C-alpha cells in the first residue's frame, strides 16, 4: 500500500427499511421487518429500464412497468409505448407535434 497507493472501496449491498402510509392517522411509519431487498428484485424483473443524460449530461435512470408476454399476471398491465414512456418518465412533450 505504501508503494503502489492502490486501495479502493466496493459496495456489495445496502440494507434499509421502507416507510408506508398508515391509513388511520395519516402518519408514515417505518416497518422494521420489511426491507428493500425483497422489493427491488421484483422491480427489476417486471420493468424496462431507460438511462438518459440530456439534463446536465448526468445519467438519470428510470424504470417503467411494461408487459412480459409469458406470465399471466404481467399481461394485465396497460400497454406501454416508447414515446409515452419518454413522456411520463422524464418530461418530454410535443408542443407542436414533435
Amino acid at each position: 500500500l505504501e508503494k503502489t497507493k492502490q486501495l479502493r472501496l466496493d459496495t456489495d449491498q445496502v440494507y434499509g427499511n421502507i416507510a408506508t402510509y398508515n391509513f388511520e392517522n395519516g402518519r408514515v411509519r417505518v416497518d422494521t421487518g420489511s426491507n428493500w431487498s425483497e422489493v427491488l428484485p421484483q422491480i427489476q424483473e417486471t420493468t424496462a429500464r431507460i438511462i438518459f443524460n440530456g439534463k446536465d449530461l448526468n445519467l438519470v435512470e428510470r424504470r417503467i412497468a411494461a408487459v412480459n408476454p409469458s406470465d399471466p399476471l404481467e399481461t394485465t398491465k396497460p400497454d406501454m409505448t416508447l414515446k409515452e414512456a419518454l413522456k411520463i418518465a422524464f418530461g418530454f412533450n410535443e408542443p407542436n407535434g414533435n
Binding site: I18, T20, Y21, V28, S34, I43, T46, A65, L73, K77
Partner: protein
C-alpha cells in the same frame, strides 16, 4: 358493491379503461375519465392493472400514488 380484485381502493373498470383524480371544493374525488371535461382542465389520465395492488411492484399503491397519500 363495485368489484375490486387487488384491494387497492379503486375499481377494476376504472383501472382498465382510465381514471383521474380531481379535488373539487376541498375534497379529493376519484372519477372515471371523461374527454369533454377533464381534458381542458389539465388533468392526467391514468391506467393501471386491476389485479396488482402496485402496478410497478414497488411498495406504494396505485391509489396512494395517484392521490398523494404517500411518503412525501
Amino acid at each position: 358493491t363495485v368489484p375490486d380484485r387487488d384491494n387497492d381502493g379503486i375499481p377494476d373498470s376504472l383501472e382498465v379503461e382510465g381514471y383521474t383524480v380531481d379535488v373539487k371544493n376541498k375534497r379529493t374525488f376519484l372519477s372515471p375519465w371523461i374527454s369533454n371535461i377533464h381534458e381542458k382542465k389539465g388533468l392526467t389520465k391514468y391506467k393501471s392493472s386491476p389485479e396488482k395492488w402496485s402496478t410497478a411492484s414497488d411498495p406504494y399503491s396505485d391509489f396512494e400514488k395517484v392521490t398523494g397519500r404517500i411518503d412525501k
